[PDB]
Amino acid sequence: PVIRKFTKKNVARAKKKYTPFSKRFKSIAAIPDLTSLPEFYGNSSELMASRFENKLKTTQKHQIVETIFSKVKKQLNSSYYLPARENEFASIYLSAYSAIESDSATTIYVAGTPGVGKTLTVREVVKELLSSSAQREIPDFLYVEINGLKMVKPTDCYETLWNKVSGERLTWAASMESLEFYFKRVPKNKKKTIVVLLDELDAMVTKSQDIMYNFFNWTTYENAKLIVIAVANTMDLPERQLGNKITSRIGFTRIMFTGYTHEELKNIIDLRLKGLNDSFFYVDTKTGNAILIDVRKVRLRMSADAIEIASRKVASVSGDARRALKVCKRAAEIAEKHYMAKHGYGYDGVQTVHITHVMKALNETLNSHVITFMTRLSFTAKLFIYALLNLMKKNGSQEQELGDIVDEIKLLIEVNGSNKFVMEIAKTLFQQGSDNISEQLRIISWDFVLNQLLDAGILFKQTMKNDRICCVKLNISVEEAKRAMNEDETLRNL
Amino acid sequence: NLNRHIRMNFETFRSLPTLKNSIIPLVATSKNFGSLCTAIKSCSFLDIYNKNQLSNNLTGRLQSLSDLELAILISAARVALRAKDGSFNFNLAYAEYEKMIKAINS
Amino acid sequence: MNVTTPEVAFREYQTNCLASYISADPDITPSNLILQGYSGTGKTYTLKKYFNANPNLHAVWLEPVELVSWKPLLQAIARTVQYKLKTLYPNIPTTDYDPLQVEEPFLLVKTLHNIFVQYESLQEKTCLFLILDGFDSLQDLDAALFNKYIKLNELLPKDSKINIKFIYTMLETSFLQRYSTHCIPTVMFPRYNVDEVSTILVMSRCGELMEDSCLRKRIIEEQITDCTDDQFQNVAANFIHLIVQAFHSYTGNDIFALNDLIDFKWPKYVSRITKENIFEPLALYKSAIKLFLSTDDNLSQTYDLSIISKYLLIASYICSYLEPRYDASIFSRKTRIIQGRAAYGRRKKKEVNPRYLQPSLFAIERLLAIFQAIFPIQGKAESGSLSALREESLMKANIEVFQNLSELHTLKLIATTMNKNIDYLSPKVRWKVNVPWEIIKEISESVHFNISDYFSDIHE
DNA sequence: AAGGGAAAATAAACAATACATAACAAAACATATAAAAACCA
Numbered sequence A: 001p002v003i004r005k006f007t008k009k010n011v012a013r014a015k016k017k018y019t020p021f022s023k024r025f026k027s028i029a030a031i032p033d034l035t036s037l038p039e040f041y042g043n044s045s046e047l048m049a050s051r052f053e054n055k056l057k058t059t060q061k062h063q064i065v066e067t068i069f070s071k072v073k074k075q076l077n078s079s080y081y082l083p084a085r086e087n088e089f090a091s092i093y094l095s096a097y098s099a100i101e102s103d104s105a106t107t108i109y110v111a112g113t114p115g116v117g118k119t120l121t122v123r124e125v126v127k128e129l130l131s132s133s134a135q136r137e138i139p140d141f142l143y144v145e146i147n148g149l150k151m152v153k154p155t156d157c158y159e160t161l162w163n164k165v166s167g168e169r170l171t172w173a174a175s176m177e178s179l180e181f182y183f184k185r186v187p188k189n190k191k192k193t194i195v196v197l198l199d200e201l202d203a204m205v206t207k208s209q210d211i212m213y214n215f216f217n218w219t220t221y222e223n224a225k226l227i228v229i230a231v232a233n234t235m236d237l238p239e240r241q242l243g244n245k246i247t248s249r250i251g252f253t254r255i256m257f258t259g260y261t262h263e264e265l266k267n268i269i270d271l272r273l274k275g276l277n278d279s280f281f282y283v284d285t286k287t288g289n290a291i292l293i294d295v296r297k298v299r300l301r302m303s304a305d306a307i308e309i310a311s312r313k314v315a316s317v318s319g320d321a322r323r324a325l326k327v328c329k330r331a332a333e334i335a336e337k338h339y340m341a342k343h344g345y346g347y348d349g350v351q352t353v354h355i356t357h358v359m360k361a362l363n364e365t366l367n368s369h370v371i372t373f374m375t376r377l378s379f380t381a382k383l384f385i386y387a388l389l390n391l392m393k394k395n396g397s398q399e400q401e402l403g404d405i406v407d408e409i410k411l412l413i414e415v416n417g418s419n420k421f422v423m424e425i426a427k428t429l430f431q432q433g434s435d436n437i438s439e440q441l442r443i444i445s446w447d448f449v450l451n452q453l454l455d456a457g458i459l460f461k462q463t464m465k466n467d468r469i470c471c472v473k474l475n476i477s478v479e480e481a482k483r484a485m486n487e488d489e490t491l492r493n494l
Numbered sequence B: 001n002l003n004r005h006i007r008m009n010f011e012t013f014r015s016l017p018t019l020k021n022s023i024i025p026l027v028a029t030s031k032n033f034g035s036l037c038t039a040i041k042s043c044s045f046l047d048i049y050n051k052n053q054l055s056n057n058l059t060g061r062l063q064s065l066s067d068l069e070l071a072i073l074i075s076a077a078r079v080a081l082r083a084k085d086g087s088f089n090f091n092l093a094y095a096e097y098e099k100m101i102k103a104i105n106s
Numbered sequence C: 001m002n003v004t005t006p007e008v009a010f011r012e013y014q015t016n017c018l019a020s021y022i023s024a025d026p027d028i029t030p031s032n033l034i035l036q037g038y039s040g041t042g043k044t045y046t047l048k049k050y051f052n053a054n055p056n057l058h059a060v061w062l063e064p065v066e067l068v069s070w071k072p073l074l075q076a077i078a079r080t081v082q083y084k085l086k087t088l089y090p091n092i093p094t095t096d097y098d099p100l101q102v103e104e105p106f107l108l109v110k111t112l113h114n115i116f117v118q119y120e121s122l123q124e125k126t127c128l129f130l131i132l133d134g135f136d137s138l139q140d141l142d143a144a145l146f147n148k149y150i151k152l153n154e155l156l157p158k159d160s161k162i163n164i165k166f167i168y169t170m171l172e173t174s175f176l177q178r179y180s181t182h183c184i185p186t187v188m189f190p191r192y193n194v195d196e197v198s199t200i201l202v203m204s205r206c207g208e209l210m211e212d213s214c215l216r217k218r219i220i221e222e223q224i225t226d227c228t229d230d231q232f233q234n235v236a237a238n239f240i241h242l243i244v245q246a247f248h249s250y251t252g253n254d255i256f257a258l259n260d261l262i263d264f265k266w267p268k269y270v271s272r273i274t275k276e277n278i279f280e281p282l283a284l285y286k287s288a289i290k291l292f293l294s295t296d297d298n299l300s301q302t303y304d305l306s307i308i309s310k311y312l313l314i315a316s317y318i319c320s321y322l323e324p325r326y327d328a329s330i331f332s333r334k335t336r337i338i339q340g341r342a343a344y345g346r347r348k349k350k351e352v353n354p355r356y357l358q359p360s361l362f363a364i365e366r367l368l369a370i371f372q373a374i375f376p377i378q379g380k381a382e383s384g385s386l387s388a389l390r391e392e393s394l395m396k397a398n399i400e401v402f403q404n405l406s407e408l409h410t411l412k413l414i415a416t417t418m419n420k421n422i423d424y425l426s427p428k429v430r431w432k433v434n435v436p437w438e439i440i441k442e443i444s445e446s447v448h449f450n451i452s453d454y455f456s457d458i459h460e
Numbered sequence D: 001a002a003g004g005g006a007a008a009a010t011a012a013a014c015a016a017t018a019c020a021t022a023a024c025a026a027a028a029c030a031t032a033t034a035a036a037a038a039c040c041a
């Protein structure tokens, strides 16, 4: 053939049609009743989604030990009736019950900081009104999860929504014309109400904001039976992206979920422990396996002030329910490994999770490690920081020339030549120990420890090929660098 | 001598994979057990190894220069010290070169 | 081990380490190895001489200097690995994967995973050495590419029968110090001595200086047929010791600059030998003295510019190194009808000599003012009062002055400030000359213009 | 011919602007393949 200027030998193209839905029935009066039609609304798709359960199955299982603390960690998982979002349940459920019962269309906007129960309680709204629809007090509907961070492209939401509505695989430019003809032209007698959840709406609108307009404008149509529950993080995402006249035309509700208080965290943690706290297990003393009601009848209480200080500390910072369920899951496995080490069960009178297990689980996520990292570096790496801290108090310029650091390291071994530690190390730091190596310009492992501190994130270095005039910041603080160097014995005396 | 080379690693690098690359040709380049028992007593290879690793860094390149290459490097280092920005040309560093060779021959 | 160490001349430490890291057993070989040295330091010599003395361990030689981007470097790895293994194991049935199909660093890993699983019927663990010879000489190189080749060993299967091993060759030691914390073994190739360059250059080139026809032809044709090979070898060896001892201070510890100064000066050294010159070496050096004093590594007027293009670089060189403040004191000549004071000139000399410094920017109208200040008299007066009024003896800027100023800009003899699509026709665009002093001095002596007097009064 | 004295020059501190390049965007230039669409047959 022709000689190609470059090759693309890894193109894999999807079998997706190009013609939209507005061109396959030739008339609005020739559109059939779409609810009594086989390939719409997912009436045959329940075979392929259940195919992949058989791939991760294997037949070997040899008596895995399920101890006392393994049952508590299973019950504090986020995947395992919700107490502290009651007015927010009653706002989303009331707005969606009215629009389904009246064959109307609306949009519900819900925002908040991460982890506050909003993806959970929207799914609990639509599960309540699936059960209300299955009892035939509202008509049947179809429910679509759209997650913006579960998409490769932002434009894949058009493909996935129209695939769930119609069972047809089209491209995205053909899917939005298929959906737009579906919502404004197809009559209300032929359609079914659709409750789509646009989850994590921040991620879809970062580049071109053409995607948030379409889902909200489709709900203003008369013939459309579409309820967009749009859950995002910030409250001003509609008004910044769309504008003021567009967000007033749509007329959507606007809910914000405040992060939970410390008393609400206690009624989440202790709600997921009602079946196990203050309860009796059957533990055999030779394997360690516990069984809820050779064997002792042990029992399990968790301390209420341990849940208190796990709630007071988490809710004061962010207030999310994930960080409190995994600070009590982390405390439950700290208590397990000491139970596992005392009796030595391994893997195949009363147990408790103290205040000291929860504090240990909570301190390790709040401590920094840049103190502990820098006290245990080399003498060479600590001499690099100690020379950099002297330069930031001769000038305070907070980005030092790298050749000013080298001359400071040489001056600091110059002046402290009476020191007992510096006399014996300056032979092993300029000639590297023995003779036959000349006295040199950089200290031994200068390229090692400069790259060790850049890789660790402690140190920032600009991009210059002149290795002497290049500039060097810190990235941690001047205080916690000085705190780590006033601990080391040999540097604080010199 | 082997515990002396461990102590230099602890003060400078403090990484056992760096000492691990030093011991590997101390063992592989030993012909018999009489030389392999001797070479870890003396550790005379680790001085030869550490000399190599650092033999063309910036001191080992300066010691591998001829006389004109050293004279131009000095001449550009005197113009870079008088300049406020540490900068120089080929014209500035040959001007300092030729007035240096005049003052030697004078 | 079970390996053979060759005898390379001045690399006896480097070959013992090279035999220490490279072996046939894949358990005792590192998956990365750098051979760092500068140019001409003999590190592809002893890398090649090590693999020739060890034929039963396998190598793939790639040059990353003729591959220019990262994507042809991945494709050549996939091409030459499977082409090596087809010659190496012809009895294995294989299906050829297109090396042009890799377009990612992962698609190399997937292709190498597919190539290596079909040699799984081999009897023992085998290592293939992938020699990236000049990895730093890749033109589009960045900091994040060498740590993409360090980690390929961890993505390829651990219990394969073919374990690819990377041997890198690199130059400049600022590239190497970016990867110091990876602790991967490195063998350094330092620069040679003056005595190591001379011994290497005399064992490399005395063979070719005999089989050269110029020494071959002359000795039979000059009718001095009284010589042996041991004089033939000693006359060429003493030339090499004499071509180093003259030009070592110019070249340094190079090998490739010495190899050029030999063969540029060996046809000129042969043609000055006769009967008294083969036997005595001191007599031949004084009869060939004029080719051991000047290197001559170079190949009417410097430019064929127009006569007004030639005065318009001169005026460009004046505007860009003289200051605008002092121009009225130097160039003004005309009598004053109206009272006024001329410019006084520079009061004291500056000891910077601005011709050493980078040229400064000027405007287009100052150039055309100094152009007609220095341009010679056109339309000379023919002693006629009828002719003297009409003459306009001083030259205005016609269509040719701007055409030659624009041609002087396309030839990169006048520069501007660098913006993409500069407009000539704008107030903001300034101009500067970029020719050295040694060119504008050759230009000024052609038109008999004394440009040195304009710069003698400033410092010289 | 002397001389006054204003133009010109020098210097130094400071402010305002230009410049070189980094980072990127976007249009021209280029290829690939499944679906439409002609189109013989």
Ligand SMILES: Nc1ncnc2c1ncn2[C@@H]1O[C@H](COP(=O)(O)OP(=O)(O)OP(O)(O)=S)[C@@H](O)[C@H]1O
Pocket: A077, A078, A079, A080, A082, A083, A084, A085, A113, A114, A115, A116, A117, A118, A119, A120, A121, A232, A233, A268, A321, A322
């Ligand atoms: N009120 C609650 N009652 C019980 N469990 C809760 C409650 N709120 C959150 N959880 C648990 O914590 C998890 C947090 O999920 P959500 O908070 O709904 O996610 P989220 O609000 O979308 O946070 P994002 O995705 O970062 S915006 C849920 O899956 C539950 O397991």
Ligand SMILES: Nc1ncnc2c1ncn2[C@@H]1O[C@H](COP(=O)(O)OP(=O)(O)OP(O)(O)=S)[C@@H](O)[C@H]1O
Pocket: C008, C009, C010, C011, C037, C038, C039, C040, C041, C042, C043, C044, C045, C046, C171, C200, C204, C255
């Ligand atoms: N020790 C040596 N003994 C004999 N010949 C040598 C020796 N070292 C170098 N040479 C020769 O001198 C030349 C040096 O070339 P190379 O070894 O290819 O240089 P290099 O180390 O690869 O540097 P670059 O990066 O390729 S320019 C070749 O012609 C070698 O044959």
Ligand SMILES: [Mg+2]
Pocket: A118, A119, A120
């Ligand atoms: Mg969520």
Ligand SMILES: [Mg+2]
Pocket: C043, C044
């Ligand atoms: Mg080479």
